[PDB]
Amino acid sequence: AIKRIGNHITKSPEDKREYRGLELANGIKVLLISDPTTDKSSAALDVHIGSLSDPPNIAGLSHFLEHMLFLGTKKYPKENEYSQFLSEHAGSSNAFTSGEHTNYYFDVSHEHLEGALDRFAQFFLSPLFDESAKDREVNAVDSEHEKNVMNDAWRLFQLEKATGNPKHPFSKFGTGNKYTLETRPNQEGIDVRQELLKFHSAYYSSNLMAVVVLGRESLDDLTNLVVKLFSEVENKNVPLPEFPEHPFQEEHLKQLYKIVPIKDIRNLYVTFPIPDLQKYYKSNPGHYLGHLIGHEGPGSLLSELKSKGWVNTLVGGQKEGARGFMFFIINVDLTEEGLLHVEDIILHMFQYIQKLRAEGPQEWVFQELKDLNAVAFRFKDKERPRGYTSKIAGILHYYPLEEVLTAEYLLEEFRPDLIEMVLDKLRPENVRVAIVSKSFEGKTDRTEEWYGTQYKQEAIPDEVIKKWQNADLNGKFKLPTKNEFIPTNFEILPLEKEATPYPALIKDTAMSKLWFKQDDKFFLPKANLNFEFFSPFAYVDPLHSNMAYLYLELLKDSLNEYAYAAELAGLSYDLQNTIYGMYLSVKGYNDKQPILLKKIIEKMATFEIDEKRFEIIKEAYMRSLNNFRAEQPHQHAMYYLRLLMTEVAWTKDELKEALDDVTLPRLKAFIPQLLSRLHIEALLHGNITKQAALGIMQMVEDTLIEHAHTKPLLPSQLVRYREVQLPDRGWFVYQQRNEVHNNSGIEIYYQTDMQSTSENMFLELFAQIISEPAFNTLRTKEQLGYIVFSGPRRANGIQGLRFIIQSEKPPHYLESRVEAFLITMEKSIEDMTEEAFQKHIQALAIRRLDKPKKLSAESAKYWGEIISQQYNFDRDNTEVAYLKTLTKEDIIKFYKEMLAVDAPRRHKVSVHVLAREMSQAPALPQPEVIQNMTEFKRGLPLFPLVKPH
């Protein structure tokens, strides 16, 4: 068909992408995306056809068809010719048939609209369905079924599909194999390929297409480009695949299934066939319901059961069904005290329902959630366009030409009748039970044919059901109050006359040190926040470290019950242990930032403790401690990395004797002594005011002085720790025999100098020239082992060079391999040509040069300068200036005294981490063994700090 209607689409005015939606006369829904600013011009072709829409003779006929629809035209019957086009134009095409939709989609390079369109549109007129392509692709569908044997999600998906009403055609199968798709149909005389021709012609080409192209030229260009060529499809009017009856017809209510998964998981899946609410889309009942389900507040059943500890995690929520019916699922991860009390958890669900009964419908939670999601959905920033097309094409089928964007995301009216329907629908009479545990071995014997999972019928006795339905008697269930707190104050602040290109020290006292520049590349309502804590006590004891660690644990554990909705309102934060103390960082929108900021400050400022919760947290991390004693050799090697590069780091054994004497009054008295004196440096960024930032800083410091009169720190005590000096040619090493792993680990480290002008580009460029030829040679060409890494390592504000490499070798022999690579680089000094140099410096420059894509991207790096006290935020420009400065003669200079073996300024580090049981040899000096690590690092020097900027 050729027909067009359309207008100015309600395009959510933060976006500038011009839009036009329509449908052709033959049942082809067409959206037209005109983005003249794009590079990758995309396209999509979705048909609303389920995997259950196959004729009953061939299960998965649509799956194998769309796996075979690409092959052979009358213009180009070659196999990958359209794929050769997309090979010419950097394209990644993909397609599927879902349970509702048979979709096809791709993109093109920049402008090859009619090129890809003509290489694409010939699938209709002559579908060849080549024989060897069929015989290979049926093995691909068998492999698709086989990789569906292991993914538990689609196993339980198909278990939901087939174990309903077996006569009703919801019980058909989706993927297919060799046997049920090839072996049995053609032996009935019903040949496959002629049925493929019939199933694409009379059935596919009839109706239900929902397509979209992403053009970029103009509106009328794409209009007469694509509306013209897709007259090739014409309507044959198939009946609509719809199941107006639910399948769960009375063999299904209160019916158990003990399911064996692949992975050892503990899960109860509770199913509700619920009516079609596609017409009820202006309310969004069900996902507002699931908002109420996984909600965490006062009287939260989540708060109840995790306070009881009975749950790992849960979700309840609406499942999109078919055109006739819909579903509703409740999915929960369990504990043993959850496992023994599942039915009571269901009873708790019933008490939650009874809580809903005591409140009925409430306008205000819907109103605030609605307004928040509305302002959010306008202020959703941008979008990965590919896949977005598939999404909108997924809902172009269900909505008219303007009701697609703000479809479910713009609610309209309060519908208490739908609320009382679903409260009336969600009943114990309505429950379908699916229990997923790996401990279901043996007693479960009626095994799945397609996948081999074991299930039982074994229905619920009526004592428990009757016991459920009369006893609706709730306990600690209480109302969660709203915490909205006005995010409408999002007006973008224009930058003042004080326009400096970086966050500046705008406020400095003995207590204050304030740093803030706002948004330039993004112009966002969010703001991101970075906050310094120092205490001396955080480096002094294993005992008090465990204390403060678990202190932060139970602490951030606590207000998360409050902070669920607020961070659910898109306001994230961070409490993180450091060796300096804690670490604070907050990110997010300007809804409630100084307010909730102050709430957090006061809350962590004064907090109370429960003894049982104390001891359970203690024991939980106690059992976490001795778990660590068998890490991976590269992971535990990274532990020795952090262990052999410091002033002191207390070991897990140091921690393990230390927990033997821990009491709650000890740290409970110690905490204000612990927080007795601090300095806080604040890094700030985003849509805020300089003078308001001054007031917020004064606020938080005065708040803490109000709490416990935390006095300012001293410059005479703000100390940092150094990296140790080798005896200028003495390279030292020792070994660590592992227990479990039979791989022998080893990792190298070096010390050039500080992050001066030269040494940064030295280490990075050198790291890059041991990236590609070494990845070419040692890991690829030699295959010494699987775990092979080569890369940087920044310790104590000093860079260096690590090799996270693990195999089963004599490590001295592997060192000899390393030394062979050093001779390789010796030859490669002159062999770095002009071109290797130029490609090499420009690739590291592109590695180096990158504008921010997030407001937090540069902030972590700035924070790295902060924790190293650097603040030259254009030292990367200095890095570019030195990248303009390296010569080939420098790497002679860099090799002789720094990199060689006779190198008089040699700073080499290595450590063996042995196993569980473990062409030119230079005159290496024999290193020592390192037994007393205390006496090892006891007598050696340290390194200089900064002549300042």
Curated annotation (Swiss-Prot):
N6-succinyllysine PTM positions: 147, 652
Q: Which UniProt keywords apply?
A: Allosteric enzyme, ATP-binding, Cell membrane, Cytoplasm, Host cell receptor for virus entry, Host-virus interaction, Hydrolase, Membrane, Metal-binding, Metalloprotease, Nucleotide-binding, Protease, Receptor, Secreted, Zinc
Bound how, and how many: what does the cofactor note say? Binds 1 zinc ion per subunit.
Q: Give binding positions for Zn(2+).
A: 63, 67, 144
Q: What does the UniProt entry list as the effect of changing residue 854 to C? A: Increases catalytic rate towards INS and amyloid
Q: Where is the active site?
A: 66
Subcellular location per UniProt equals: Cytoplasm, Cytosol; Cell membrane; Secreted
Q: Provide the GO MF annotations for this entry.
A: amyloid-beta binding; ATP binding; ATP hydrolysis activity; beta-endorphin binding; endopeptidase activity; identical protein binding; insulin binding; metalloendopeptidase activity
- Record: residues binding substrate: 291-297, 314-318
Instruction: Tell me the impact of changing residue 485 to A.
Output: Strongly increased enzyme activity
Query: Which GO biological process entries does UniProt record here?
Result: amyloid-beta clearance; amyloid-beta clearance by cellular catabolic process; amyloid-beta metabolic process; antigen processing and presentation of endogenous peptide antigen via MHC class I; bradykinin catabolic process; hormone catabolic process; insulin catabolic process; insulin metabolic process
Fill in the domain comment: The SlyX motif may be involved in the non-conventional secretion of the protein.
Q: Additional info? A: ATP-binding induces a conformation change.
Q: What is this protein called?
A: Insulin-degrading enzyme
What is this organism's lineage?
Eukaryota, Metazoa, Chordata, Craniata, Vertebrata
Gene behind this protein: IDE
